[PDB]
Design a protein around this motif. Structure first.
Motif, PDB file in Angstrom:
ATOM      1  N   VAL A  69       0.859  -1.085   0.083  1.00 49.62           N
ATOM      2  CA  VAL A  69      -0.015  -0.022   0.079  1.00 49.62           C
ATOM      3  C   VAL A  69       0.856   1.301   0.127  1.00 49.62           C
ATOM      4  N   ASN A  70       1.911   1.229   0.521  1.00 48.58           N
ATOM      5  CA  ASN A  70       2.948   2.515   0.812  1.00 48.58           C
ATOM      6  C   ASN A  70       3.188   2.908  -0.588  1.00 48.58           C
ATOM      7  N   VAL A  71       3.672   1.623  -1.382  1.00 46.58           N
ATOM      8  CA  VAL A  71       3.975   2.096  -2.976  1.00 46.58           C
ATOM      9  C   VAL A  71       2.904   2.696  -3.676  1.00 46.58           C
ATOM     10  N   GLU A  72       1.799   1.962  -3.518  1.00 46.72           N
ATOM     11  CA  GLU A  72       0.482   2.411  -4.307  1.00 46.72           C
ATOM     12  C   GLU A  72       0.125   3.598  -3.925  1.00 46.72           C
ATOM     13  N   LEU A 122       4.433  -0.580   8.828  1.00 45.66           N
ATOM     14  CA  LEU A 122       3.891   0.561   9.281  1.00 45.66           C
ATOM     15  C   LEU A 122       2.898   1.193   8.533  1.00 45.66           C
ATOM     16  N   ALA A 123       2.856   1.177   7.146  1.00 47.80           N
ATOM     17  CA  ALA A 123       2.127   1.657   6.087  1.00 47.80           C
ATOM     18  C   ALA A 123       0.690   0.882   6.206  1.00 47.80           C
ATOM     19  N   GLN A 124       1.039  -0.624   6.334  1.00 55.26           N
ATOM     20  CA  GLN A 124      -0.135  -1.468   6.237  1.00 55.26           C
ATOM     21  C   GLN A 124      -1.229  -1.278   7.742  1.00 55.26           C
ATOM     22  N   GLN A 125      -0.453  -0.609   8.523  1.00 57.80           N
ATOM     23  CA  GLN A 125      -1.229  -0.348  10.026  1.00 57.80           C
ATOM     24  C   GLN A 125      -1.836   0.980  10.082  1.00 57.80           C
TER      25      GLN A 125
END
Ligand SMILES: [K+]
Ligand SMILES: [K+]
Ligand SMILES: [K+]
Ligand SMILES: [Mg+2]
Ligand SMILES: [Mg+2]
Ligand SMILES: [Mg+2]
Ligand SMILES: [Mg+2]
Ligand SMILES: [Mg+2]
Ligand SMILES: [Mg+2]
Ligand SMILES: [Mg+2]
Ligand SMILES: [Mg+2]
Ligand SMILES: [Mg+2]
Ligand SMILES: [Mg+2]
Ligand SMILES: [Mg+2]
Ligand SMILES: [Mg+2]
Ligand SMILES: [Mg+2]
Ligand SMILES: [Mg+2]
Lengths: 162, 272, 294, 312, 43
Positions: free
Chosen positions: A7-10, C22-25
């Motif tokens: 998700v961070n890259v998206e 951390l981005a997935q939380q």
RNA sequence: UUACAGACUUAAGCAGUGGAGCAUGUUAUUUAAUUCGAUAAUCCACGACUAACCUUACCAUAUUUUGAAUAUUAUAAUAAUUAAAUUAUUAUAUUACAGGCGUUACAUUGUUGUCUUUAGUUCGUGCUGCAAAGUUUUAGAUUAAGUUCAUAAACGAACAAAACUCCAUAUAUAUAAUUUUAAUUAUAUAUAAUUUUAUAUUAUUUAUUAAUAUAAAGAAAGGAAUUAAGACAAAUCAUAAUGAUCCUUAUAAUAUGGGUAAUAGACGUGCUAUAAUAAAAUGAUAAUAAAAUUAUAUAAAAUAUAUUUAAUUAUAUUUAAUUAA
């Protein structure tokens, strides 16, 4: 199984996410200025992404009225004041507002975006700190000093004698 | 290590290119303060095979310099290849500027993908100050990366009705504020940039607020109740702004003429 | 989509797993991402941003606006080469273009041979190997215009294979004499003609030909006689393959008109013994050749 | 598309040599004045000498001063012809030529690097990034300076017939039209590859109520399938091919004489056959065109070299 | 520029503007168009 | 020297110039100096977007002499380096010089004024003439106009261009927690027109056409930038820069005061006025703007005086807010 794109890259490929404003306590106003819009908009988008991960509800970038400066010159170096050239400069402005955030987190935002600033972009930050009426421990000019010195000098005391 | 280039004694045993890289780092970092060292020359002689440079030349080049190389060359007349034909191997300077733009974009993209997420460790829950115990607002200003005189300016604004003043003391407070009180908005705002540091100016405004509150709450001699509030300053400000204070008449509204939602079987059927 | 650490740990480096966790939380799984149509933050292609490209990314250790190293920790100590070579093949040669590696190995004869083959269908090998080119006239002419005198280079050349085929070409260029010769060489090959030769050494009989103001008197010669003629005619005979010839030029001796007149005479003023015999229905015998026959 | 991508247009910020904005206008004027003075100083640091007869002249372009909130980066392009040791040996790996010594005092020297001196002049962190250009006709500024300062013996008694010929065979005469049409086809292909990716990702379905509000089409991989860094970036980059160049001379080389050399293309067809739109740098210069002038002094006096390159 | 000869002793910089001026001075001396010797205040 | 076309002009219309006073520039003259240009079109509120001092380039008087630069060589004072010498800095001195709004725009860089023409120039190939050359229909049609189209032993390419474009306008999306409010807005992105359609009429080269009218659709009606060549050896050496030549105790540098503001005549450009389709007062829940400016600031309200109930106007006192949607 294909390569997973987390998700961070998206997020990088989509508009920056914004956190909901709960209380509406305005804590800071960040105004960005540049003579061009392109870096200004790109940098403004980066600030919104930084704030989201820091937990700062952010609004904007709100476009403020562009200032135009104008200068009219005579093209010839010596005479011929009938042919005049026009020149101009446009100041582009953007306002990003921060809400419902603690002072420490707000300083982290300003520190990070300062470290990774873009060329030709300026930044003014107005911080708003709500305080109590009565605080603990709280929150002579050069000319006046010289006047006293001058009025004591003999060239002035010799007259003040009564 | 960072300091390895400063210890030529420890270069023995390093691979050929690493020794040359450490030899180039010691010359670049020292410059005019660079003095030939035996250990350094010993290591460079060990690279005579990685470069195929005669072991004798290395010694001359290491002591002579560019002049030594010019002698080894035998002459200083190299063809002038300033108008040589283009071999489609480099980019124009204007295209290299667009590549730099893209290098910057990718730099920021990488920060947003893997560096910004790490900022979530520092999230702190908003400890809202109670709106009643904290009625005063101090505005500070910071011009990032600039020395600006206005950065010292501090502004203090509070709603007079949130100061906890009695009726008579509230009236005296508003009379003594004069142009600093706006009856329409009920805001008392005073700013100071007299001192050089914002902290100094913040205290100064705070001290004036305490002084004004004490005088307003001391109604033993005069309460200024006979004196009516003067708003002439506010009126002048209002005349300089435009007032759109007109709303659509309520008795003109025709709610029966508004479009009526139509029945769509598809949407009604797609919901079940 | 949120992926388990196991899957993400088999594709992404360990150093980047903490950021992904951390981005997935912080980003809920039900986030409806929107596309920005004002600012394009991401590149126009997909990239995980896990590897530093040697060209499309900033060079590690190089100073620049966004360099994260301290000013005393840069690692670029050599400045004699380009730091970031072009990516991929290493060139940007446009599709359909060739790297000018060799220059000066180009042959004006080979440039004429290639162009003419594409334009007329003549064999390149014959032009580049069998033909000999000899300039005959090289002068500068000028046209008077309002701007001023415009000079031009004029070149008249003769080409031939020394075996009957000869051609005359003319060329003009305002730039340089070499370009005029190239055009003349190009024109000459297009004008190649076959000339009758008696015993492949001389002409059939004598020729008295008038070309404009040039009076050409050419006489056939015995074997081993050589070429005893005007210098312009000599060069043409060499290319054409004429070995024995005598003759005189009367009235106008303009080189250009002698060359053209000679070529015209060799074609329009000669008749082979075979052509004479067939037209008249008679046998023509070369007495000298019969005398030495079986 | 063209102005919404960093690889297809030149940021307008790059049209100015000083890229800065300060709320304090006085500090901005000072920074602008400081950038001109440092640019002049750097021009004086490019000429180096090893011995009386070995003077190496490095040709430097004008500086690009990138003023951010925390630092100042001074970026410039330089050209150096290594005439002292232009061999096939590796002798250059054992000594620092004069040009490497000059470049290493910008940032590497630990005691007297130019960045620290400038950091006090500007009161901010300063970095210098020299970028080497291998040809003199890749930057209009470098090209003008070279001619003006190094090719004087070629045009001081008229433009040598060989000198002009070299200035006309620098680049093969590329056909601007096919190159322009090849670029437009690549853009259409990339644009049609993404539309097909989404059309397929939609027709395959990757809450009906939510199927009327959200626009999320699906996985990033599928939307950008077959669009990678190995095929997209280098095909969309603009201003990649020199298609035209004009070199003018003027002055006294007893009356001034002007000679003009013109060779190639002075236009861009990418803007006519496609919706892509041209931009004017500083609102008067076309973007493809880069023009610079350099003057020098001879026995007669001042003469100017005006070079204009057209990169499409 | 005058501070460069002490900041960077290893490098030898050339001032082309200064060098051009010095050449014009020598040339005028050779043509006899030099500058008159300046009078001394002591005189 | 012929014909045609084009504008150029003229006409019409509105307000002026030319007349009075004053402002301003120039000329002439005067003056210790009234600094110097520019000085038909293409000078004359021009250089100059502010001449009391300064500015300043002029005049009078007094005063300075390696001067603002770079380098050389000495001398010192100072800090490091190196075992007292070296090197750094600084000051002084020394001599090449520095300096010059001194001359030369008709020796120059750059810039600019004024005009002309662009379907303009070159390149490639082909073709005609022995050739220098020419490239042919064509002195095409059409439009307000390269406007649009057609055509020829010519066919392409390149630029020149036109355009593409940017601006304005119309609309859409995004952004603003609609108290920095003008959401009737701001500014990023994208779209739109070089308008389109049919219908009757009139001409035609009558065809797959123009000129008109007519109905229909649409917000759609205006601008910009830049250059291609050449001429006036047109302006500028006084924006700065260069060669030559001249000054070097003075043609350089500083200070005080004066001048550039003088006044017979003449000229250019402006302002105000010569009254009733037009001037003067008054109009406070305040008729109705836009674009700018404010850290080398913009200055509110209030009070005091002129001055009278008050208002108005001017100044003082005081210095609220804002360094700004
Ligand atoms: K031709
Ligand atoms: K005066
Ligand atoms: K009147
Ligand atoms: Mg105040
Ligand atoms: Mg008022
Ligand atoms: Mg206002
Ligand atoms: Mg004075
Ligand atoms: Mg004066
Ligand atoms: Mg001089
Ligand atoms: Mg003077
Ligand atoms: Mg004159
Ligand atoms: Mg012919
Ligand atoms: Mg509103
Ligand atoms: Mg005057
Ligand atoms: Mg009146
Ligand atoms: Mg009103
Ligand atoms: Mg007032």
């Amino acid at each position: 199984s294909t390569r997973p794109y987390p998700v961070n890259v998206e997020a990088v490929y989509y508009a920056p996410l914004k956190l909901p404003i709960k209380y509406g306590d305005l804590v800071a106003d960040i105004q960005l200025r540049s003579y061009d819009n392109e870096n200004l908009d790109f940098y403004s988008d980066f600030i919104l992404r930084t704030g989201y991960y820091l937990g700062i509800p952010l609004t904007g970038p709100k476009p403020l009225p562009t200032r135009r400066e104008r200068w009219t010159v005579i093209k010839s170096p010596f005479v011929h004041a009938k042919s005049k050239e026009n020149f101009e400069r446009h100041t582009h402005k953007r306002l990003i507002r921060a809400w419902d955030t603690n002072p420490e987190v707000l300083q982290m935002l300003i520190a990070y975006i300062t470290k990774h600033s873009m060329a030709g972009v300026g930044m003014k930050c107005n911080f708003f700190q709500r305080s109590e009426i009565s605080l603990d421990l709280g929150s002579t000019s050069a000319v006046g000093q010289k006047v006293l010195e001058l009025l004591d000098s003999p060239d002035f005391k010799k007259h003040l004698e009564k | 290590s960072a300091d390895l280039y400063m210890h030529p004694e420890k270069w023995k045993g390093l691979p050929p290119q690493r020794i040359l890289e450490l030899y180039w780092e010691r010359m670049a970092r020292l410059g005019s303060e660079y003095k030939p060292n035996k250990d350094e020359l010993n290591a460079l002689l060990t690279t005579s095979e990685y470069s195929n440079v005669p072991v004798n030349d290395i010694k001359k080049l290491y002591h002579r310099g560019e002049q030594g190389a010019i002698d080894i060359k035998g002459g200083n007349v190299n063809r002038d290849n300033s108008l040589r034909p283009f071999m489609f191997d480099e980019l124009p300077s204007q295209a290299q500027e667009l590549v730099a733009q893209h290098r910057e974009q990718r730099f920021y993209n990488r920060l947003a993908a893997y560096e910004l997420p790490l900022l979530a460790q520092y999230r702190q829950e908003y400890k809202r100050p109670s709106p009643e115990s904290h009625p005063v607002t101090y505005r500070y200003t910071s011009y990032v990366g600039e020395e600006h005189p206005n950065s010292r300016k501090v502004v203090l604004s509070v709603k007079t009705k949130e100061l906890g003043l009695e009726e008579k003391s509230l009236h005296k407070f508003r009379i003594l504020a004069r142009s600093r009180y706006d009856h329409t908005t009920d805001i008392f705002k005073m700013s100071s940039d007299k001192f050089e540091h914002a902290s100094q100016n913040a205290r100064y405004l705070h001290d004036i607020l305490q002084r004004l509150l004490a005088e307003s709450k001391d109604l033993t001699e005069d309460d200024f109740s006979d004196v009516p509030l003067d708003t002439r300053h506010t009126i002048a400000k209002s005349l300089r702004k435009k007032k759109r204070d007109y709303e659509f008449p309520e008795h003109w509204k025709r709610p029966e003429d508004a479009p009526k939602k139509k029945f769509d079987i598809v949407d009604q059927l797609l919901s079940t | 989509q949120h992926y388990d650490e196991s899957l993400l740990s088999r594709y992404y480096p360990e150093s980047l797993l903490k950021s992904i966790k951390l981005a997935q939380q912080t980003i809920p799984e039900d986030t409806k991402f929107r596309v920005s149509r004002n600012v394009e933050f991401a590149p126009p292609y997909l990239d995980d941003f896990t590897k530093i490209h040697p060209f499309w990314d900033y060079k590690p250790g190089m100073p620049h606006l966004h360099a994260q190293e301290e000013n005393n920790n840069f690692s670029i100590f050599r400045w004699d080469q380009v730091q970031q070579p072009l990516p991929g093949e290493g060139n940007i040669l446009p599709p359909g273009v060739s790297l000018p590696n060799d220059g000066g190995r180009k042959s004006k004869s080979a440039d004429v041979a290639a162009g003419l083959h594409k334009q007329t269908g003549v064999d390149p090998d014959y032009i580049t190997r069998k033909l000999t080119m000899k300039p005959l006239v090289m002068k500068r002419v000028s046209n008077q215009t309002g701007k001023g005198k415009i000079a031009s280079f004029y070149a008249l050349v003769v080409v031939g294979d020394k075996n009957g085929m000869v051609g005359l070409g003319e060329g003009k260029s305002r730039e340089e004499m070499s370009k005029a010769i190239f055009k003349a060489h190009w024109d000459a090959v297009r004008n190649l003609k076959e000339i009758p030769r008696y015993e492949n050494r001389t002409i059939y009989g004598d020729i008295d030909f008038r070309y404009h103001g040039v009076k050409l008197h050419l006489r056939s010669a015995k074997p081993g006689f050589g070429l005893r003629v005007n210098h312009v005619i000599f060069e043409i005979c060499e290319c054409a393959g004429i070995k024995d010839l005598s003759g005189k030029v009367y009235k106008s001796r303009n080189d250009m008109n002698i060359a053209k007149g000679t070529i015209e005479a060799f074609t329009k003023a000669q008749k082979t013994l075979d052509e004479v015999a067939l037209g008249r229905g008679k046998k023509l015998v070369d007495v000298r050749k019969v005398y030495y026959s079986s | 598309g063209n102005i919404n991508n960093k690889l297809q247009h030149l940021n307008n910020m790059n049209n100015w040599n000083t890229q800065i904005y300060n709320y304090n206008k006085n500090m901005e004027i000072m920074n602008t004045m400081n950038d001109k003075l440092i640019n002049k100083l750097l021009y004086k640091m490019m000429t180096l000498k090893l011995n009386n007869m070995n003077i190496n002249k490095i040709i430097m372009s004008k500086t690009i001063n990138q003023h951010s909130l925390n630092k100042l980066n001074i970026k410039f392009y330089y050209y150096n012809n290594d005439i002292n040791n232009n061999n096939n040996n590796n002798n250059n790996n054992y000594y620092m030529n004069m040009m490497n010594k000059l470049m290493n005092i910008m940032n590497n020297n630990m005691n007297n690097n130019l960045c620290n001196i400038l950091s006090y002049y500007y009161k901010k962190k300063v970095t210098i990034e020299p970028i080497k250009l291998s040809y003199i006709y890749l930057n209009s500024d470098i090209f003008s300076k070279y001619i003006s300062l190094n090719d004087m013996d070629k045009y001081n008694n008229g433009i040598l017939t060989n000198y002009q010929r070299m200035l006309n065979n620098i680049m093969p005469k590329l056909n601007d039209h096919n190159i322009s049409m090849n670029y437009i086809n690549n853009i259409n292909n990339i644009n049609n590859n993404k539309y097909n990716n989404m059309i397929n990702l939609l027709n395959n379905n990757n809450n009906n109520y939510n199927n009327n509000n959200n626009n999320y089409i699906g996985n990033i991989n599928n939307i950008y399938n077959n669009m990678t860094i190995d095929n997209i970036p280098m095909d969309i980059l603009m201003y990649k091919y020199l298609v035209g160049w004009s070199i003018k001379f003027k002055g006294r080389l007893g009356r001034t004489s002007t000679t003009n050399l013109l060779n190639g293309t002075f236009n861009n067809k990418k803007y006519l056959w496609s919706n892509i739109n041209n931009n004017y740098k500083l609102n008067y210069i076309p973007s493809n065109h880069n023009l610079y002038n350099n003057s020098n002094i001879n026995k007669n006096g001042k003469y100017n070299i005006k070079v204009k390159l057209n990169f499409i | 520029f005058r501070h460069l000869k002490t900041l960077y002793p290893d490098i030898e910089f050339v001032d082309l503007e200064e060098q051009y001026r010095l050449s014009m001075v020598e040339a005028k001396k050779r043509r006899g168009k030099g500058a008159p010797k300046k009078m001394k205040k002591d005189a």
